[PDB]
Amino acid sequence: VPDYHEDIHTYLREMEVKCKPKVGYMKKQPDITNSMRAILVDWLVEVGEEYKLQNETLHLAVNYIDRFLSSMSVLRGKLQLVGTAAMLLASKFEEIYPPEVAEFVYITDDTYTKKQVLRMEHLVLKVLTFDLAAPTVNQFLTQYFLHQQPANCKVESLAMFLGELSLIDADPYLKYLPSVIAGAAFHLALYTVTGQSWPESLIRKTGYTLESLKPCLMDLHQTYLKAPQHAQQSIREKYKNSKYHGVSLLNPPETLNL
Amino acid sequence: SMENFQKVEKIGEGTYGVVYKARNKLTGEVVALKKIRLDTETEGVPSTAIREISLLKELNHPNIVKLLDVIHTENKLYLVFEFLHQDLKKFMDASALTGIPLPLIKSYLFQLLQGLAFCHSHRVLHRDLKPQNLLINTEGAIKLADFGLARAFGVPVRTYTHEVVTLWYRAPEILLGCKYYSTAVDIWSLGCIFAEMVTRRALFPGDSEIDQLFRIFRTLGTPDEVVWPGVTSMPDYKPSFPKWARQDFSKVVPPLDEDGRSLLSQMLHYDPNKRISAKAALAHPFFQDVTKPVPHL
Amino acid sequence: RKLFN
């Protein structure tokens, strides 16, 4: 699957910006906090696992919420509605078989109605102006993974997990583009497992170096170290699974030598 | 919103609803209105529509049908497309005694490949390239339309829907139950369409998956591990397949003059890998002298 | 599950 490879990357690189959330958005949200968002995102991971939905779908949802919240005030009491509608749309976009609306009502233990979820769905489509093909940390990762010598599943799964980790903490990751996060996640995965660095083929491809990833890498390396004590555990729980080669069990490195 | 438009006549579909030739009262612009019935729709906005709209927004190209606006009442969803006069199928039936002139065929294929290259460059598979979804204008333009079945893909692709591409135009990889399919499926569809514009008949008008397979195999030869590594390994490969010799390709599409044969040959390669890409195809000697003339209606 | 209230 190339051709194309470069064109698409170039294209996602541009949409990345076009699609980035507002970095400060949470400061402007009277009734909600990064902390509650984390809960939402964590909840969505659980759901993702529950329904066996693509990681991409999870990544799409969070892009939606963050974009939606970048321009719509929401009361804590409705933040979850925004969450499900986001997941529903993500599902409808990405999934071969999206869960039916009822299922999303049901996973809130009936906190909203099919009618609320649908009406929230419209709102979100209105607020995003149907702009749903968002580049994701995951999208960039699957590209980066192609530059591995040779392919390694623990690396692939560990980047996923790490990338997925970042979705939870608006502060700081909200300030880094999906390709940059995917850079940190990828290299951190490769180092941890193999003791290898960010590939020069990827420098050629991305124009990123360890130099440029560093800031994010520093943040990602902390999230990795502080992962077992994080308030939210659904992602580590998820990545205990054999499906993901139990990568959340592998030990974070003590240092990076950067 | 809908105030500005005045319906003229319906023309086609759905599901979704009907497509509507309509005139912008204020600007003059003649448009196509895809009305998409909601009323809560029990399931909200169809994934089809959602994809159609989101992908179409990102696809701004002279040979991709232009979504001009989404009109968004809480009861109905209205899609405003640039109006194009007919579809390629319709046009081919009109040509079904004169024939379609060679310069028009080149022009049309060339444009198709442009819009297709563009889609593929933007990580979008069309996944339903058939003459009925290729719209022509009076000016000589042909445009990919109906992004109902399209899909944003990642690199590399993962697994997407299998019930994909109208049978006559469905690539062997899909027929043989491939785990992963890619851009090569749209090229396949185009290769068929290319034969179709020449022969004015479908290349492989099968009425089931296995029939389709066998139709293809009879024309291009039953693939083996030499022509298509991993075939005999695919989920719906049966060793019991009749094993046909590949026809002399001058016989598949007799009037095609040798540059075309080459091109088609590479569009219809069994191996999605080896199968030419929209991008590469544009450079083909077949198009060395392409213009983009007006059709004859 | 419900998330906040």
Side-chain angles (χ1 to χ4, degrees):
Chain A
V1 189
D3 210 276
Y4 303 137
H5 67 137
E6 168 180 69
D7 299 52
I8 283 153
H9 172 95
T10 300
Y11 181 62
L12 295 181
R13 284 294 291 269
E14 291 145 2
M15 294 305 285
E16 228 189 356
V17 197
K18 272 108 187 304
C19 268
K20 196 182 175 160
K22 183 169 76 150
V23 186
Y25 92 67
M26 204 58 85
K27 289 143 70 76
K28 291 79 166 170
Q29 287 279 0
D31 195 33
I32 61 193
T33 60
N34 291 336
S35 200
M36 322 188 86
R37 176 189 169 279
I39 299 187
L40 187 75
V41 184
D42 182 78
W43 178 63
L44 287 173
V45 172
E46 216 142 32
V47 169
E49 256 226 305
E50 178 71 1
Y51 283 90
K52 267 218 192 48
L53 300 170
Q54 300 296 312
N55 289 343
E56 177 61 16
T57 308
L58 209 208
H59 282 80
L60 288 170
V62 173
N63 177 258
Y64 301 170
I65 304 151
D66 287 348
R67 274 164 72 203
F68 186 97
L69 301 193
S70 301
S71 59
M72 299 287 276
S73 283
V74 199
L75 304 185
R76 66 124 56 64
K78 291 294 201 311
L79 180 54
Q80 205 193 343
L81 187 47
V82 182
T84 12
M87 199 71 180
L88 168 61
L89 285 170
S91 285
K92 272 167 170 186
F93 186 88
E94 191 66 17
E95 293 294 328
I96 308 172
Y97 316 88
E100 40 215 53
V101 184
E103 305 295 337
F104 291 91
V105 174
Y106 180 87
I107 54 179
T108 64
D109 188 45
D110 294 31
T111 311
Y112 313 99
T113 63
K114 282 127 215 146
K115 186 211 158 76
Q116 282 196 300
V117 171
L118 265 23
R119 298 217 301 109
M120 182 50 80
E121 176 196 57
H122 247 304
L123 185 45
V124 177
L125 287 168
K126 179 203 172 317
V127 172
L128 305 183
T129 62
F130 281 84
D131 289 327
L132 296 182
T136 56
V137 169
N138 170 51
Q139 281 172 75
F140 279 104
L141 276 182
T142 74
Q143 295 207 66
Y144 297 169
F145 293 173
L146 291 188
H147 289 242
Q148 211 188 161
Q149 273 189 29
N152 182 299
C153 281
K154 281 93 213 319
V155 175
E156 297 208 3
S157 281
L158 196 58
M160 295 310 294
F161 163 67
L162 287 171
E164 207 153 304
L165 271 191
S166 94
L167 295 176
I168 300 285
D169 295 303
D171 181 355
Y173 302 115
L174 225 65
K175 67 162 160 281
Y176 304 104
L177 290 166
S179 55
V180 165
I181 290 151
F186 178 72
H187 160 68
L188 193 37
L190 205 58
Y191 183 78
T192 301
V193 178
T194 72
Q196 293 169 306
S197 281
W198 188 247
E200 94 81 39
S201 76
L202 286 171
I203 304 169
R204 295 199 283 104
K205 182 183 208 155
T206 56
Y208 303 143
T209 56
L210 291 102
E211 184 94 10
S212 27
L213 297 177
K214 187 163 156 185
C216 185
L217 195 39
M218 297 316 278
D219 288 348
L220 196 66
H221 180 212
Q222 296 305 313
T223 282
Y224 199 10
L225 277 152
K226 285 226 79 156
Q229 293 92 56
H230 200 293
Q232 278 71 38
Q233 289 299 316
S234 305
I235 285 157
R236 289 185 76 244
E237 225 59 65
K238 174 166 167 194
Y239 288 81
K240 277 181 175 53
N241 198 280
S242 57
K243 188 170 206 151
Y244 308 97
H245 313 78
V247 286
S248 79
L249 301 157
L250 293 157
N251 306 134
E254 311 179 26
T255 53
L256 307 175
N257 72 89
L258 259 62
Chain B
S1 69
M2 279 298 294
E3 160 80 67
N4 308 320
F5 300 92
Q6 164 231 184
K7 297 176 181 73
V8 166
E9 53 174 44
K10 64 289 132 211
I11 0 91
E13 281 179 76
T15 328
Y16 280 115
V18 274
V19 182
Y20 243 116
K21 166 158 171 155
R23 192 165 62 248
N24 192 305
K25 288 221 287 304
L26 300 170
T27 59
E29 192 181 25
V30 182
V31 312
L33 297 181
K34 205 180 277 202
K35 170 180 157 172
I36 291 156
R37 44 204 74 271
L38 266 66
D39 41 280
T40 218
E41 215 221 17
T42 51
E43 285 312 285
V45 198
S47 49
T48 352
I50 292 172
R51 287 184 181 163
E52 184 166 19
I53 296 172
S54 56
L55 309 169
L56 250 349
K57 289 197 92 200
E58 301 209 353
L59 295 178
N60 192 50
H61 185 108
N63 300 116
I64 297 175
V65 69
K66 201 130 289 174
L67 188 61
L68 302 173
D69 204 11
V70 168
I71 282 156
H72 212 129
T73 62
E74 218 221 36
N75 38 288
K76 286 181 197 181
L77 200 57
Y78 276 103
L79 305 211
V80 191
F81 294 98
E82 62 161 315
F83 174 69
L84 285 104
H85 305 64
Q86 61 185 178
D87 53 75
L88 180 56
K89 179 211 159 69
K90 178 66 218 298
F91 174 65
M92 287 193 281
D93 304 339
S95 249
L97 272 314
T98 53
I100 302 182
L102 201 261
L104 214 69
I105 289 160
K106 284 215 206 87
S107 164
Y108 273 3
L109 188 54
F110 197 68
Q111 293 179 70
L112 297 174
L113 295 141
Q114 284 190 51
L116 192 55
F118 189 96
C119 287
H120 290 173
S121 290
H122 293 56
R123 55 97 178 68
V124 173
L125 304 175
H126 190 272
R127 295 195 312 169
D128 202 9
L129 269 340
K130 64 212 201 179
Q132 301 74 13
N133 304 139
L134 308 174
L135 300 192
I136 60 156
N137 74 11
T138 52
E139 222 44 63
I142 186 165
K143 290 168 173 181
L144 322 186
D146 205 328
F147 282 64
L149 276 135
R151 205 210 161 88
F153 71 95
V155 171
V157 291
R158 60 150 203 278
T159 301
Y160 314 125
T161 12
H162 190 286
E163 300 71 50
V164 133
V165 193
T166 283
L167 192 63
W168 290 356
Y169 309 93
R170 182 174 321 161
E173 321 91 88
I174 299 161
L175 293 157
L176 291 162
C178 199
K179 317 67 47 71
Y180 306 134
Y181 64 78
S182 199
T183 37
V185 310
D186 291 334
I187 289 312
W188 183 267
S189 295
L190 266 201
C192 302
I193 286 171
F194 170 26
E196 205 165 314
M197 283 189 305
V198 173
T199 54
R200 244 163 312 112
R201 145 188 40 261
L203 198 53
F204 310 123
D207 27 49
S208 67
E209 303 212 285
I210 192 78
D211 181 20
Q212 201 69 29
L213 263 188
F214 285 5
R215 293 230 187 212
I216 288 156
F217 292 174
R218 284 197 288 276
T219 288
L220 311 175
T222 305
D224 47 36
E225 288 290 333
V226 175
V227 72
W228 187 7
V231 261
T232 64
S233 217
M234 307 197 74
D236 298 323
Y237 187 80
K238 304 156 177 291
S240 54
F241 280 166
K243 274 158 160 158
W244 288 280
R246 167 183 189 90
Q247 258 185 329
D248 166 17
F249 219 86
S250 69
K251 295 322 189 287
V252 180
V253 181
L256 218 42
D257 222 39
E258 190 216 327
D259 273 332
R261 263 207 301 289
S262 170
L263 178 53
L264 182 59
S265 152
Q266 296 172 260
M267 303 188 71
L268 303 175
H269 200 296
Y270 272 104
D271 196 334
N273 249 70
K274 264 181 275 183
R275 188 182 311 164
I276 195 172
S277 72
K279 193 149 93 178
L282 296 166
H284 193 286
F286 183 55
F287 307 109
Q288 62 168 262
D289 66 302
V290 65
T291 58
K292 275 132 82 275
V294 177
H296 32 96
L297 200 78
Chain C
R1 67 163 186 294
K2 185 173 192 281
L3 281 173
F4 308 94
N5 172 43

PDB file of all heavy atoms in Angstrom, chain A residues 212-223:
ATOM      1  N   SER A 212      13.150  17.791  17.275  1.00  0.00           N
ATOM      2  CA  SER A 212      11.816  18.383  17.178  1.00  0.00           C
ATOM      3  C   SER A 212      10.746  17.635  17.996  1.00  0.00           C
ATOM      4  O   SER A 212       9.818  18.247  18.532  1.00  0.00           O
ATOM      5  CB  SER A 212      11.386  18.552  15.715  1.00  0.00           C
ATOM      6  OG  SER A 212      12.017  17.613  14.867  1.00  0.00           O
ATOM      7  N   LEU A 213      10.874  16.320  18.103  1.00  0.00           N
ATOM      8  CA  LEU A 213       9.922  15.564  18.895  1.00  0.00           C
ATOM      9  C   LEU A 213      10.130  15.787  20.386  1.00  0.00           C
ATOM     10  O   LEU A 213       9.173  15.865  21.140  1.00  0.00           O
ATOM     11  CB  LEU A 213      10.020  14.088  18.548  1.00  0.00           C
ATOM     12  CG  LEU A 213       9.653  13.797  17.101  1.00  0.00           C
ATOM     13  CD1 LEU A 213       9.829  12.328  16.791  1.00  0.00           C
ATOM     14  CD2 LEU A 213       8.239  14.251  16.827  1.00  0.00           C
ATOM     15  N   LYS A 214      11.395  15.912  20.779  1.00  0.00           N
ATOM     16  CA  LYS A 214      11.837  16.083  22.168  1.00  0.00           C
ATOM     17  C   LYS A 214      10.792  16.642  23.139  1.00  0.00           C
ATOM     18  O   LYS A 214      10.399  15.937  24.072  1.00  0.00           O
ATOM     19  CB  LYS A 214      13.140  16.896  22.225  1.00  0.00           C
ATOM     20  CG  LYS A 214      13.778  16.988  23.606  1.00  0.00           C
ATOM     21  CD  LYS A 214      15.238  17.436  23.517  1.00  0.00           C
ATOM     22  CE  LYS A 214      15.717  18.104  24.825  1.00  0.00           C
ATOM     23  NZ  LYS A 214      17.111  18.664  24.731  1.00  0.00           N
ATOM     24  N   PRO A 215      10.335  17.894  22.931  1.00  0.00           N
ATOM     25  CA  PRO A 215       9.366  18.500  23.852  1.00  0.00           C
ATOM     26  C   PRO A 215       8.154  17.599  24.170  1.00  0.00           C
ATOM     27  O   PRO A 215       7.818  17.394  25.346  1.00  0.00           O
ATOM     28  CB  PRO A 215       8.907  19.747  23.092  1.00  0.00           C
ATOM     29  CG  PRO A 215      10.045  20.097  22.230  1.00  0.00           C
ATOM     30  CD  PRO A 215      10.685  18.808  21.827  1.00  0.00           C
ATOM     31  N   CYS A 216       7.517  17.088  23.112  1.00  0.00           N
ATOM     32  CA  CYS A 216       6.415  16.128  23.193  1.00  0.00           C
ATOM     33  C   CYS A 216       6.883  14.820  23.804  1.00  0.00           C
ATOM     34  O   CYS A 216       6.267  14.310  24.737  1.00  0.00           O
ATOM     35  CB  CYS A 216       5.872  15.864  21.792  1.00  0.00           C
ATOM     36  SG  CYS A 216       4.439  14.812  21.709  1.00  0.00           S
ATOM     37  N   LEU A 217       7.974  14.283  23.260  1.00  0.00           N
ATOM     38  CA  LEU A 217       8.640  13.111  23.801  1.00  0.00           C
ATOM     39  C   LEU A 217       8.880  13.204  25.312  1.00  0.00           C
ATOM     40  O   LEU A 217       8.667  12.234  26.041  1.00  0.00           O
ATOM     41  CB  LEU A 217       9.960  12.907  23.071  1.00  0.00           C
ATOM     42  CG  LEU A 217      10.712  11.576  23.175  1.00  0.00           C
ATOM     43  CD1 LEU A 217       9.781  10.348  23.163  1.00  0.00           C
ATOM     44  CD2 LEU A 217      11.704  11.507  22.025  1.00  0.00           C
ATOM     45  N   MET A 218       9.311  14.368  25.785  1.00  0.00           N
ATOM     46  CA  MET A 218       9.492  14.575  27.219  1.00  0.00           C
ATOM     47  C   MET A 218       8.164  14.411  27.954  1.00  0.00           C
ATOM     48  O   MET A 218       8.105  13.817  29.034  1.00  0.00           O
ATOM     49  CB  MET A 218      10.098  15.950  27.508  1.00  0.00           C
ATOM     50  CG  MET A 218      11.491  16.155  26.944  1.00  0.00           C
ATOM     51  SD  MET A 218      12.571  14.732  27.212  1.00  0.00           S
ATOM     52  CE  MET A 218      13.090  15.030  28.913  1.00  0.00           C
ATOM     53  N   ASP A 219       7.099  14.932  27.356  1.00  0.00           N
ATOM     54  CA  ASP A 219       5.788  14.856  27.965  1.00  0.00           C
ATOM     55  C   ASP A 219       5.229  13.454  27.893  1.00  0.00           C
ATOM     56  O   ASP A 219       4.617  12.974  28.847  1.00  0.00           O
ATOM     57  CB  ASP A 219       4.833  15.824  27.286  1.00  0.00           C
ATOM     58  CG  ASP A 219       5.138  17.261  27.614  1.00  0.00           C
ATOM     59  OD1 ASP A 219       5.935  17.523  28.544  1.00  0.00           O
ATOM     60  OD2 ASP A 219       4.573  18.137  26.933  1.00  0.00           O
ATOM     61  N   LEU A 220       5.436  12.809  26.751  1.00  0.00           N
ATOM     62  CA  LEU A 220       4.961  11.455  26.534  1.00  0.00           C
ATOM     63  C   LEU A 220       5.709  10.473  27.417  1.00  0.00           C
ATOM     64  O   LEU A 220       5.117   9.534  27.940  1.00  0.00           O
ATOM     65  CB  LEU A 220       5.073  11.063  25.062  1.00  0.00           C
ATOM     66  CG  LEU A 220       4.254   9.822  24.696  1.00  0.00           C
ATOM     67  CD1 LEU A 220       2.741  10.055  24.825  1.00  0.00           C
ATOM     68  CD2 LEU A 220       4.608   9.358  23.320  1.00  0.00           C
ATOM     69  N   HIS A 221       7.001  10.711  27.604  1.00  0.00           N
ATOM     70  CA  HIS A 221       7.792   9.847  28.456  1.00  0.00           C
ATOM     71  C   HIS A 221       7.324   9.918  29.907  1.00  0.00           C
ATOM     72  O   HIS A 221       7.319   8.900  30.618  1.00  0.00           O
ATOM     73  CB  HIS A 221       9.262  10.191  28.350  1.00  0.00           C
ATOM     74  CG  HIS A 221      10.140   9.336  29.203  1.00  0.00           C
ATOM     75  ND1 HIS A 221      11.303   9.805  29.777  1.00  0.00           N
ATOM     76  CD2 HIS A 221      10.023   8.042  29.588  1.00  0.00           C
ATOM     77  CE1 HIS A 221      11.869   8.834  30.472  1.00  0.00           C
ATOM     78  NE2 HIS A 221      11.111   7.754  30.374  1.00  0.00           N
ATOM     79  N   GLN A 222       6.916  11.111  30.340  1.00  0.00           N
ATOM     80  CA  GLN A 222       6.319  11.264  31.668  1.00  0.00           C
ATOM     81  C   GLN A 222       5.000  10.524  31.737  1.00  0.00           C
ATOM     82  O   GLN A 222       4.794   9.730  32.647  1.00  0.00           O
ATOM     83  CB  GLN A 222       6.143  12.733  32.081  1.00  0.00           C
ATOM     84  CG  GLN A 222       7.461  13.530  32.239  1.00  0.00           C
ATOM     85  CD  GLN A 222       8.474  12.881  33.206  1.00  0.00           C
ATOM     86  OE1 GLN A 222       8.125  12.470  34.322  1.00  0.00           O
ATOM     87  NE2 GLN A 222       9.735  12.794  32.769  1.00  0.00           N
ATOM     88  N   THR A 223       4.115  10.748  30.772  1.00  0.00           N
ATOM     89  CA  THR A 223       2.819  10.079  30.827  1.00  0.00           C
ATOM     90  C   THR A 223       3.016   8.572  30.960  1.00  0.00           C
ATOM     91  O   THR A 223       2.398   7.942  31.812  1.00  0.00           O
ATOM     92  CB  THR A 223       1.888  10.477  29.658  1.00  0.00           C
ATOM     93  OG1 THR A 223       1.331  11.762  29.940  1.00  0.00           O
ATOM     94  CG2 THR A 223       0.736   9.490  29.504  1.00  0.00           C
TER      95      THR A 223
END
